């Protein structure tokens, strides 16, 4: 569970996927803005055992 | 109050409003260039 | 490295300054109509 919600884990995953590599335009500043948007596309919601 | 009167009152003076609203908005954008 | 600057975030200043400018211009026009 700790690795799932980690900001670091989401960053390393996108850098090695072909989905992200074909979307790089070649400008250093633009790629960083694009990458930060992808990190927020994954959301983790913790559960509660009281409500099952 | 007379809202129908009020909109007619502001209809004639719209030029005065738009002449200085943009200027007051333009008062900033230099403090932004002078801040941290 | 951060991607975007935190302050002074010009957009909010632009919007709120313009809103205040429109309000004060409408008030000044209303006063001028009674002043003429």
Swiss-Prot record, chain B:
Q: Where in the cell is it found?
A: Cell inner membrane
Phenotype reported upon loss of the gene = Null mutation abolishes ECA(CYC) synthesis.
| Ranges that cross the membrane | 15-35
Q: Which family does it belong to?
A: Belongs to the WzzB/Cld/Rol family.
Record text on subunit structure and interactions: Probably part of a complex composed of WzxE, WzyE and WzzE.
Q: Report the protein's function.
A: Modulates the polysaccharide chain length of enterobacterial common antigen (ECA). Required for the assembly of the phosphoglyceride-linked form of ECA (ECA(PG)) and the water-soluble cyclic form of ECA (ECA(CYC)).
Name of the molecule in the record: ECA polysaccharide chain length modulation protein
Q: Which organism is it from?
A: Escherichia coli (strain K12)
């Amino acid at each position: 569970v700790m690795q799932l919600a980690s900001w670091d884990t989401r960053r390393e995953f996108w850098l090695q996927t072909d989905y992200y590599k074909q979307r790089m335009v070649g400008n250093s500043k633009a790629d960083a803005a694009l990458l930060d948007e992808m990190i927020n596309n994954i959301q983790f919601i913790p559960g509660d055992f009281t409500r099952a | 109050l007379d809202i129908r009167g009020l909109f007619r009152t502001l209809w004639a003076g719209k030029l005065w409003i738009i002449g200085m609203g943009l200027a007051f908005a333009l008062i900033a954008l230099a403090y932004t260039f002078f801040a941290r | 490295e951060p991607v975007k600057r935190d302050s002074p975030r010009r957009a909010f200043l632009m919007i709120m300054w313009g809103i205040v400018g429109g309000l004060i211009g409408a008030g000044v026009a209303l006063t001028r109509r009674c002043s003429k």
